[PDB]
């Protein structure tokens, strides 16, 4: 398992940590980002999923940084949807980690986690 000190993570910034050899993306989303995330039409998603089914707390987006296409790690704060861009085959993810464009068929997978005060525990 593994812990992360959320008290440290500033406002709109990303943090990448290792868990089971795979990278885990954690973003401290800004209010505007939280809105942009829950204000998108499902019909504009090949893998329909509400932001609420993906995060327990709107403030903390936590997901595995593994592109569902062929495995590469998406670059943060890149791409045409204010989210992540995978350099390998051109897959764009939005501020909720959902698949918006490219060959990837699924949204970035959400791992099991629990909160605990100023820190979170992934695993």
């Amino acid at each position: 398992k593994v812990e992360v000190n959320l008290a440290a993570i500033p406002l709109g910034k990303n943090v990448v940590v290792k868990w089971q050899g795979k990278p885990v993306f954690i973003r401290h989303r800004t209010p505007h980002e939280i809105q942009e995330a829950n204000s998108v039409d499902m019909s504009a998603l090949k893998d329909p999923q509400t932001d609420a089914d993906r995060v327990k707390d709107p403030q903390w987006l936590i997901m595995l940084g593994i592109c569902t296409h062929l495995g590469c790690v998406p670059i943060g704060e890149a791409g045409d949807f204010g989210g992540w861009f995978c350099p390998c085959h051109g897959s764009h993810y939005d501020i909720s980690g959902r698949i918006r464009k490219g060959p990837a068929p699924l949204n970035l997978e959400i791992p099991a986690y629990e909160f605990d005060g100023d820190k979170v525990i992934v695993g």
């Binding site: 990448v16 790690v73 670059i75 390998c88």
Partner: peptide, 24 residues
């Protein structure tokens, strides 16, 4: 294991096949 460079490109001899894959 945590960073795929944005400058990632396959070895030159595999590019044509790589381009074919990206086209779909």
């Amino acid at each position: 294991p945590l960073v795929t460079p944005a400058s990632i490109v396959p070895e030159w001899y595999l590019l044509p096949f790589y381009a074919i894959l990206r086209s779909i």
